[PDB]
Amino acid sequence: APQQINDIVHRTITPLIEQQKIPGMAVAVIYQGKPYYFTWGYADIAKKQPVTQQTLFELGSVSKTFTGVLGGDAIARGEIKLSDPTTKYWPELTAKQWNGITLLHLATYTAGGLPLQVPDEVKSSSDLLRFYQNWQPAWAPGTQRLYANSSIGLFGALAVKPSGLSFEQAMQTRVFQPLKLNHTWINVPPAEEKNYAWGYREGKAVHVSPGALDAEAYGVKSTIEDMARWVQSNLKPLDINEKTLQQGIQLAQSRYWQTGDMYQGLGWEMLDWPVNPDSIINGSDAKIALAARPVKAITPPTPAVRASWVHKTGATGGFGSYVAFIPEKELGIVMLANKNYPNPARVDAAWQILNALQ
Ligand SMILES: *[B]([O])([O])[C]([N]C(=O)[C]C1=[C][C]=[C]S1)C1=[C][C]=[C][C]=[C]1
Ligand SMILES: [K+]
């Protein structure tokens, strides 16, 4: 690798791993559009398996960027519209609080305070309908943002209904396969288990447990190579040959709502660049508090702005992920770890690397 990239990555990441006691980590830097890869430590401490470029990590909520792009692809195909009422795709949702809640609201966490998590007791399709029917919004639609797996999760499930495919099949056929993400999975096949890192929580090896709307909200596993390819695809959507997928990516980085310095896309979140990491932390879900924030509608949404810091954090019980990129600089980073360590530390490291290289 170019020595400047080698140096800033190692000089940043080695102390981060020490500070945070991270067992294993993989990083990719995308510079002038080429990926450069770095690995440290262990995918499996007990079996002494190193992190490699082929190691699978749980992306956690970075999965929402795939969900948002898959939804964008469905809009581009003319299967759904973000202006559609939720009830067009789920007419069984007859409770009157749903009147006025659109797919846009679900996708962007603005439906009125859908909860963060779907309860563990929701096990069946019947259970899931009961949950949404019984939910009482705190706020009118389109007035406050409250980050929520139950919101964008439901968006993903509904978005694929016109296709006639399961969510997983749709993601595979319409996003993973066209982009050559051949080691990216909603369900890790047995053949790939040799690559699947363990997550570590309180020093115990753990993997994400099944849950309602898991695929849609937090269920993707991927390698550093495929994640670098995902960043490249999102940096340069005009190089994508499949027209609806190119359009979908563009829709997911459109700016739909503003809160403070932050703009909400479909899965992706964005700020204007230049921006400093304290302002990114407070302008994002990377902060340690669960924040209800009033939002301003961007009427109509601003198309994807090249001068942006585009990012997403993710976690599972045992993993912590971060992706950020700046389109007008052809520059991005992926950080995958098998420990859920504090978000500000992720952003700090990412910014330190990208600002050195831009
Ligand atoms: B995401 O913001 O990373 C999301 N992830 C998950 O819900 C997956 C997890 C399973 C167990 C622990 S995290 C998230 C939302 C709200 C709280 C934490 C993580
Ligand atoms: K599920």
From Swiss-Prot:
InterPro entries: Bact_CellWall_Synth/Modif (IPR050491), Beta-lactam-related (IPR001466), Beta-lactam/transpept-like (IPR012338), Beta-lactam_class-C_AS (IPR001586). It is found in: Periplasm. GO terms for biological process: antibiotic catabolic process; response to antibiotic. Inhibited by the beta-lactamase-blocking agents avibactam, enmetazobactam, relebactam, nacubactam, vaborbactam, taniborbactam, zidebactam, and beta-lactam-analog boronic acids, via a covalent binding to Ser-61. Inhibited by non-beta-lactam, benzo(b)thiophene-2-boronic acid (BZBTH2B) and various cyclic boronates. Not inhibited by clavulanic acid. Inhibited by O-aryloxycarbonyl hydroxamates, via cross-linking of the active site Ser-61 to Lys-312. Weakly inhibited by citric acid. Its main location: periplasm. Its EC number is 3.5.2.6. Keywords: Antibiotic resistance, Hydrolase, Periplasm, Signal. The active site is at residue 61. One of its GO terms (cellular component) is outer membrane-bounded periplasmic space. Class C beta-lactamase which confers resistance to penicillins and cephalosporins. Has benzylpenicillin- and cephaloridine-hydrolyzing activity. Has weak cefuroxime, cefotaxime, cefoxitin and oxacillin-hydrolyzing activities. Monomer. NCBIfam families: bla_class_C (NF033085), BlaEC (NF000185), CMY2-MIR-ACT-EC (NF012173). Belongs to the class-C beta-lactamase family. This is Beta-lactamase. The gene is ampC.
